[PDB]
């Protein structure tokens, strides 16, 4: 499991920036999917749209080889959601 | 030579006090913390007061882009305190 920071900005307001820390990527993705379900029985396209509607979403995922964090973009997160709902 | 920096903050025990900022350099992120320290005091103080403010935040950390690897170094509160001191004193 890789320590993961989820960075979110819900609206164009810069004071809408929030974050959470998770023991694993799967835990972070689970938290993201809960935000979607709360806003919403659904198709994967609706999850993509929910992610597109956030002003910002990204993850920082710990890499045990370097001891540093890899930044992952919204497109990488959509690909993880795609693979979870195959 | 500037490095993109994400500042992660939780000001109080409230989970909803978490926020983050994006900065073009470490200097700009450190100055955000200096401005928070000043705005809490709202400029005559001692270094123990800057450290006290940083210690009383519920959480504070930085993620700093590292050109050598393309990845982000997580810096802890203790490192941030030393860097705030050095930048205020003058490098």
UniProtKB/Swiss-Prot annotation, chain A:
Q: In which tissues is it expressed?
A: Expressed in the germline (at protein level).
Q: Where is coiled-coil annotated?
A: none
Keywords, alphabetical: Cell cycle, Cell division, Chromosome partition, Cytoplasm, Nucleus, RNA-mediated gene silencing
> Disruption effect?
RNAi-mediated knockdown results in chromosome segregation and cell division defects in early embryos. RNAi-mediated knockdown results in defective activity of the PIWI-interacting RNA (piRNA) silencing pathway. RNAi-mediated knockdown disrupts the localization of tofu-6 to the perinuclear region of the germline. RNAi-mediated knockdown results in larger tofu-6- and pid-3-expressing foci. RNAi-mediated knockdown results in decreased expression of tost-1 in the germline and in embryos.
Would you tell me the Gene Ontology cellular component terms? cytoplasm; nucleus; perinuclear region of cytoplasm; RNA cap binding complex
Q: Where in the cell is it found?
A: Cytoplasm; Cytoplasm, Perinuclear region; Nucleus
- BP terms from Gene Ontology: 21U-RNA metabolic process; cell division; chromosome segregation; embryo development ending in birth or egg hatching; piRNA processing; positive regulation of cell division; positive regulation of chromosome segregation
Subunit details for this protein?
May form a homodimer. Component of the pid-1 variant of the PETISCO complex (also called the pid-3, erh-2, tofu-6, and ife-3 small RNA complex) containing at least pid-1, tofu-6, ife-3, pid-3, and erh-2, which is required for the biogenesis of a class of 21 nucleotide PIWI-interacting RNAs (piRNAs) that possess a uracil residue at the 5'-end (also called 21U-RNAs). Within the complex interacts with pid-1.
What does the sequence similarity comment in the record state about its family?
Belongs to the E(R) family.
Q: What does this protein do?
A: Required for chromosome segregation and cell division in early embryos. Component of the pid-1 and tost-1 variants of the PETISCO complexes, which have roles in the biogenesis of a class of 21 nucleotide PIWI-interacting RNAs (piRNAs) that possess a uracil residue at the 5'-end (also called 21U-RNAs) and embryogenesis, respectively. Within the tost-1 variant of the PETISCO complex binds to splice leader SL1 RNA fragments to possibly play a role in their processing. Promotes the biogenesis of 21U-RNAs.
Q: What is this protein called?
A: Enhancer of rudimentary homolog 2
**Which species expresses this protein natively?**
Caenorhabditis elegans
Q: What is the lineage of its organism?
A: Eukaryota, Metazoa, Ecdysozoa, Nematoda, Chromadorea
The gene for this chain is erh-2
